Amino acid sequence: IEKERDVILQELQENDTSMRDVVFNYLHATAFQGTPLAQSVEGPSENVRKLSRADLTEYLSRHYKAPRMVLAAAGGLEHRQLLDLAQKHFSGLSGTVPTLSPCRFTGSQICHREDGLPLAHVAIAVEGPGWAHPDNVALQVANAIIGHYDCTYGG
Amino acid sequence: TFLRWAAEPEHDHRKRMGLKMLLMMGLLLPLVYAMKRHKWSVLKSRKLAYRPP
């Protein structure tokens, strides 16, 4: 717990270099400001220097539960070879929890001006509909209608 | 009364535009003043910070 607590703080220095990951971290932090989703995934340095075994115990004690978990596999197997193993091992799982707050959307701007670098990674985005909304099929096309390009395609 | 009309054959009409003006300009002036405050609201609410090492 204490060793890794240094490993984490080593990486938040590293991800300063991961400029792409900087942006999406900023981006999610704006549109979903005030909500949980604006949080990063690795978290602030501070909480990593205050974290406890018990908060993890509680966190573990609430989210890792059968009604909200999935097992899946593929390859040269059979679905019934597997079904016994879940009935063997995970049958001892605690099979018994808040639901979602609708995370709103914001139209806001953020800008970490820094002239000392070569270039500027930039991002822009809008509200997305979500998973079950069927028009996501259409949008994945339009992203591909516009497509992509990076400094290598001889076309 | 007669002589004022001499050097003002427009009195009956000056006030007419005298009145049309107000209920327009009195009505526009807030709206434009809002469209001003509308666009500028980005900067009427803009925050900063300073995060070097």
UniProtKB/Swiss-Prot annotation, chain A:
The modification N6-acetyllysine is found at residues 3, 88. The modification N6-succinyllysine is found at residue 3. The modification Phosphoserine is found at residue 52. It is found in: Mitochondrion inner membrane. Transmembrane segments: none annotated. It comes from the Eukaryota. Coiled coil: none annotated. Component of the ubiquinol-cytochrome c oxidoreductase, a multisubunit transmembrane complex that is part of the mitochondrial electron transport chain which drives oxidative phosphorylation. Belongs to the peptidase M16 family. UQCRC1/QCR1 subfamily. This is Cytochrome b-c1 complex subunit 1, mitochondrial. It comes from Bos taurus (Bovine). The lineage of its organism: Eukaryota, Metazoa, Chordata, Craniata, Vertebrata. The gene is UQCRC1. The chain holds residues 161 to 320 of 480 of the full protein.
Swiss-Prot record, chain B:
Residues 45-53 are mitochondrial matrix. It is found in: Mitochondrion inner membrane. The chain crosses the membrane at residues 11-44. It comes from the Eukaryota. Component of the ubiquinol-cytochrome c oxidoreductase, a multisubunit transmembrane complex that is part of the mitochondrial electron transport chain which drives oxidative phosphorylation. Belongs to the cytochrome c family. Component of the ubiquinol-cytochrome c oxidoreductase (cytochrome b-c1 complex, complex III, CIII), a multisubunit enzyme composed of 11 subunits. The complex is composed of 3 respiratory subunits cytochrome b, cytochrome c1 and Rieske protein UQCRFS1, 2 core protein subunits UQCRC1/QCR1 and UQCRC2/QCR2, and 6 low-molecular weight protein subunits UQCRH/QCR6, UQCRB/QCR7, UQCRQ/QCR8, UQCR10/QCR9, UQCR11/QCR10 and subunit 9, the cleavage product of Rieske protein UQCRFS1. This is Cytochrome c1, heme protein, mitochondrial. It comes from Bos taurus. The gene is CYC1. The chain holds residues 272 to 324 of 325 of the full protein.
